[PDB]
């Protein structure tokens, strides 16, 4: 592992706060639940070997948008928006 990401919402408890180390990617996500409520989260997406998937998850719910990037702390600058309907 060699990548540092910002995290919030669900940080691994090996956090010096708002930082997880990973070998995969950094992510930020937005989702809205069954009432209009929208919650943010960010953290580490673990390296998945041959598999990888960030934007292309046709099975994922519609009211969810996630973005990925692979630079030290790249996800602070990250602001995913729900589609408009």
């Amino acid at each position: 592992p060699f990548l540092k990401c910002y995290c919030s919402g669900h940080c691994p408890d090996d956090a010096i706060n708002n930082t997880c180390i990973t070998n995969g990617h950094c992510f930020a996500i937005i989702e809205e639940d069954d009432q209009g409520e929208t919650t943010l989260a960010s953290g580490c997406m673990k390296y998945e070997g041959s598999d990888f998937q960030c934007k292309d998850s046709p099975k994922a719910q519609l009211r969810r948008t996630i973005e990925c990037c692979r630079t030290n702390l790249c996800n602070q600058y990250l602001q995913p928006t729900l589609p408009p309907v």
Epitope: H10, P12, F27, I29, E31, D34, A41, M45, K46, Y47, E48, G49, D51, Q53, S57, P58, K59, A60, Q61, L62, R63, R64, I66
Partner: antibody, heavy 120, light 108 residues
Framework: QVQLVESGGGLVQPGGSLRLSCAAS????????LNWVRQAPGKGLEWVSY????????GYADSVKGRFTISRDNSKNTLYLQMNSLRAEDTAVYYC?????????????WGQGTLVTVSS | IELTQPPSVSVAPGQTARISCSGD??????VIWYQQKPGQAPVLVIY???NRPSGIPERFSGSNSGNTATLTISGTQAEDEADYYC???????????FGGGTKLTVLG
């Protein structure tokens, strides 16, 4: 407050077909992937099938491919599973289940299943 | 492609239970855990390898590395007696795969 209710199970001979329905509510239905998952009495969970939210992507377990056709009607709020060429191995309690992703998919809400029992 | 859980695991009241789930390179896949009580639907308890849905007690945690994912129930109670299944996303036909599930007995 999500709800999911399976119906249409029951008895069938081998080679028969049944159609299972499951009625969704408490969520904007067409925004979510739905699954069929089953469980033979007192054995373990076996995943059967998914349809994407828009109904266009579809997927099956080898043990059912070609015999079962999943589908949905986003008009009603209803998910279906057409079970043909039934066998003893298909007897199981059937569950429909909603898919939801954070980073990756999980099934957050399940119906309470109908029993399908296949027997001559 | 194939998840292996021990059929049954038992603990004394109050003690920690560890339920394992193993398969080729499991630690490069995200694992999900369900608890299931007699007569009812399975219930989500852990969702990316280790997130708790709001409303599942802190008592439950999961971890995943190597070939092994683990559901850990700290100070466990009668009410925790149930079957637990692990699972993960398979690429066959683009579905999900379940462990054979394990029965947690809280020695009474």
């Amino acid at each position: 407050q999500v709800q999911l209710v399976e119906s249409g199970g029951g008895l069938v001979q081998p080679g028969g077909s049944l159609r299972l329905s499951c009625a969704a509510s408490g969520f904007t239905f067409s925004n979510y992937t739905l699954n069929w998952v089953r469980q033979a009495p007192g054995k373990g969970l076996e995943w059967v099938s998914y349809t994407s939210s828009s109904g266009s992507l579809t997927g099956y377990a080898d043990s059912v491919k070609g015999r079962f056709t999943i589908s949905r009607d986003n008009s009603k709020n209803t998910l279906y599973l057409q079970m043909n060429s039934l066998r003893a191995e298909d007897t199981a309690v059937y569950y429909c289940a909603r898919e939801r992703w954070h980073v990756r998919g999980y099934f957050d809400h399940w119906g309470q299943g109908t029993l399908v029992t296949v027997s001559s | 492609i194939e998840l292996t859980q021990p059929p049954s695991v038992s603990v004394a009241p109050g003690q920690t239970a560890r339920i394992s789930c193993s398969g080729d390179s499991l630690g490069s896949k995200y694992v999900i855990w369900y608890q299931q009580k007699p007569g009812q639907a399975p219930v989500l308890v852990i969702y990316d390898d280790s997130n708790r849905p709001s409303g599942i007690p802190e008592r439950f945690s999961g971890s995943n590395s190597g070939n092994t994912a683990t559901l850990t129930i700290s100070g466990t109670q009668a009410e925790d007696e149930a079957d637990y299944y692990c699972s993960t996303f398979t690429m066959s036909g683009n579905g999900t795969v379940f462990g054979g599930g394990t029965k947690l007995t809280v020695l009474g």
